[PDB]
Design a protein around this ligand. Structure first.
Ligand SMILES: [Cl-]
Ligand SMILES: [Cl-]
Ligand SMILES: [K+]
Ligand SMILES: [Mg+2]
Ligand SMILES: [Mg+2]
Ligand SMILES: [Mg+2]
Ligand SMILES: [Mg+2]
Ligand SMILES: [Mg+2]
Ligand SMILES: [Mg+2]
Ligand SMILES: [Mg+2]
Ligand SMILES: [Mg+2]
Ligand SMILES: [Mg+2]
Ligand SMILES: [Mg+2]
Ligand code: NA
Ligand code: NA
Ligand code: NA
Ligand code: NA
Ligand code: NA
Ligand code: NA
Ligand code: NA
Ligand code: NA
Ligand code: NA
Ligand code: NA
Lengths: 119, 194, 65, 49, 81
RNA sequence: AGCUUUACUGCAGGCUGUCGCUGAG
RNA sequence: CGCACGGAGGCGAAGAACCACAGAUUUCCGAAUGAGAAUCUCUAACAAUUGCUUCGCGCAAUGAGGAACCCCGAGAACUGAAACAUCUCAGUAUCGGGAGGAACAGAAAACGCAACGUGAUGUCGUUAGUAACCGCGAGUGAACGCGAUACAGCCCAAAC
């Protein structure tokens, strides 16, 4: 909430989540804030996911500002445990990253835009 | 590359700046309405917790503890005292608020033992510290190498004997040389002069 | 004396319970006599009735009844 | 005063402890034992409680 | 475990109740109720218990005055033991 | 030792300035 | 067949008594734990606080004791200063909390015989009534090093 500066329309969210599962089978993804973080740092990040229900918030506060100075596009997920399930994990995940999608690029490509457009 | 953690940490260098500032201005509110000892499922400072011995495992608990701010709550003398000993206002306790917190917490969880603790802020009248505790009886811990040590009998009630880290520090045991003549190997063995 | 361990063990879980209740009743009447200024006693016996009972019980424990 | 079943038992024990040292013990001990070093008179003494 | 009946309370007064009211007096265990005392007796002696009065004695023991049914005879019972 | 006071020295308590809680124009 | 040497009686060659280890039994109150209560009572019980959790007291923990010793907190006054306030008595007496068979300490952000040197920690001897403190009064008072004792070094957090 303190690091959330724009709300992602329920449906737009679905699209992002869909692209993730497909990217988890066509290409590569990063589960867990630590790995996500290093991606944004090692540039190897296309699109990153951040949950809206995380406590403590410290764990994620840095994602936005960090991404916003590395070009890497990022979108918000409302529930932490859907992101986990999407990434392919039993448990939930605070934030994940899509490293080289796969058959999800067009979608992602547009999501990246769709969001930029959502400011 | 910088671990994700390193950010959580760097953010607390100045708990009164940016996001962490507003975050505190918000939490403390829900905090000032919580109890004395509140078990919480996740550490507000993951870097620190993990650093001090935390581990998202079983038998590992955390709890936030508030303690009043200020000097000792002392009662004036009701019998003869020489001037030196008639003080009240400026007398302070020899055990830091952090240690006070580690104890209030440990007592709330009789079966557990204190592993460590760290600060998490303070408003105008109180201080909050989060305390990491351990179920010395859980097999998940009895089998973890980086922790099973705390199961030893001689580790029982360690916080009340000052074996905690904040304890050994508050005991003047930091330095190994000059200055620690009356602290090591023990305050009491040095006739309480440190 | 007028009862042994082996002999107590050569009984069946139903024979001891049987022997037990026997002694008790004997004991109880012994006491009844004493209570009424009993004289035709043989003190070394009312003492035994207690030890025997102990033994039968000790055994009911060991033998699993 | 109304007593309880517990109190009544204690008193009973006390009354009993307040008896002579059996005549025979004297002989059995060649008279080294004669006095009940615990005689408690109702008037002259005071029972706890 | 503890036994309900300790033994026959035998004294002049107990005799009277026996020879006059068909009553048998017993020294029983203090945790025993009247009903328990009743049963126990009808068993160890094979009779019919009509009524039972109890009293906690200054001896640390509980005395019970048991009255038998008109059929059974107190004297005849007590005689055998 | 109790007691007193414009005895000596201090300690509670009260009033007051300041700092922290403490932010917007 | 206790101390305990009486009387009556009994037990033991089916090896008793007696001693060693192991086991059985082991009332009520008692941390006292279903609830209450001057050791009893009333209608199934880990009361209470916790951990894990089949989220069910299901599996566990705590509580209390102990000669002193130990560790962490609270902390006098008589007294000495020939009065007395700092100082001293003394971090003593006493109080609160807690561990063990021993505790605590412990592998250098050390020492600083200043070195081309020592090498975790307790303790004992000495260093020394030295340095240092103090109405610079009365008093208070180490350490490094040295000789001994015994020696023992390791584990995470993070980077990947
Ligand atoms: Cl502890
Ligand atoms: Cl050296
Ligand atoms: K003084
Ligand atoms: Mg390892
Ligand atoms: Mg020591
Ligand atoms: Mg009498
Ligand atoms: Mg009555
Ligand atoms: Mg005077
Ligand atoms: Mg009770
Ligand atoms: Mg003087
Ligand atoms: Mg002088
Ligand atoms: Mg001194
Ligand atoms: Mg030195
Ligand atoms: Na505890
Ligand atoms: Na000091
Ligand atoms: Na009297
Ligand atoms: Na009797
Ligand atoms: Na006076
Ligand atoms: Na025993
Ligand atoms: Na349960
Ligand atoms: Na003097
Ligand atoms: Na004087
Ligand atoms: Na001075």
């Amino acid at each position: 909430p303190v690091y959330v500066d724009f709300d992602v329309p329920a449906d737009l969210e679905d699209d992002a989540l869909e692209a993730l599962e497909v990217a988890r089978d066509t290409g590569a993804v990063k589960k867990g804030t630590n790995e996500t973080t290093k991606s944004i740092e090692r540039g190897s990040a296309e699109l990153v996911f951040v949950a809206e229900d995380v406590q403590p918030e410290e764990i994620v506060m840095h994602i936005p500002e960090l991404a916003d100075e590395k070009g890497v596009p990022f979108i918000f997920v409302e529930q932490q445990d859907d992101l986990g399930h999407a990434a392919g994990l039993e448990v939930g995940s605070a934030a994940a990253a899509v490293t080289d999608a796969g058959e999800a690029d067009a979608d992602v490509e547009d999501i990246a835009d769709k969001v930029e457009e959502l400011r | 590359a910088r671990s994700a953690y390193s950010y959580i940490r760097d953010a607390w260098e100045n708990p009164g700046d940016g996001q962490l500032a507003e975050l505190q201005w918000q939490r403390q509110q829900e905090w000032r309405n919580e109890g004395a000892v509140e078990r919480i499922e996740r550490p507000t400072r993951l870097d620190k917790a993990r650093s001090q011995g935390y581990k998202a495992k079983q038998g590992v608990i955390v709890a936030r503890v508030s303690v009043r701010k200020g000097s000792a709550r002392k009662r004036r003398h009701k019998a003869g005292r020489r001037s030196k000993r008639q003080g009240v206002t400026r007398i302070t306790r020899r055990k830091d608020i952090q240690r006070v917190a580690e104890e209030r917490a440990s007592r709330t969880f009789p079966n557990l033992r204190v592993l460590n603790s760290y600060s998490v802020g303070q408003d105008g009248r109180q201080k909050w510290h989060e305390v990491i505790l351990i179920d010395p009886n859980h097999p998940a811990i009895q089998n973890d190498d980086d922790l099973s040590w705390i199961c030893a009998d001689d580790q029982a009630d360690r916080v009340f004997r000052g074996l905690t880290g904040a304890g050994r520090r508050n005991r003047g045991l930091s330095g190994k040389g000059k200055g620690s003549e009356k602290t090591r190997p023990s305050l009491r063995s040095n006739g309480g002069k440190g | 004396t007028v009862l042994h361990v082996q002999e107590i063990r050569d009984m069946t879980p139903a024979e001891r319970e049987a022997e037990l209740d026997d002694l008790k009743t004997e004991l109880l009447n012994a006491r009844a006599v004493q209570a009424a200024g009993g004289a035709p006693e043989n003190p070394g016996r009312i003492k035994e009735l207690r030890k025997a009972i102990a033994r039968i019980k000790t055994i009911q424990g060991e033998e699993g009844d | 005063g109304k007593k309880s079943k517990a109190t009544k038992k204690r008193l009973a024990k006390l009354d009993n402890q307040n008896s002579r040292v059996p005549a025979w013990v004297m002989l059995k001990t060649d008279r080294e034992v004669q006095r009940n070093h615990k005689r408690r008179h109702w008037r002259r003494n005071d029972t706890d409680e | 475990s503890w036994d309900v009946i300790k033994h026959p309370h035998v004294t002049e007064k107990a005799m009277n109740d026996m020879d006059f009211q068909n009553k048998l007096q017993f020294a029983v265990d203090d945790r025993a109720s009247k009903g328990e005392v009743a049963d126990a007796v009808e068993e160890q002696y094979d009779v019919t218990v009509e009524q039972v009065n109890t009293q906690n004695t200054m001896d640390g023991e509980k005395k019970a005055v048991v009255r038998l049914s008109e059929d059974d005879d107190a004297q005849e019972v007590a005689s055998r033991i």
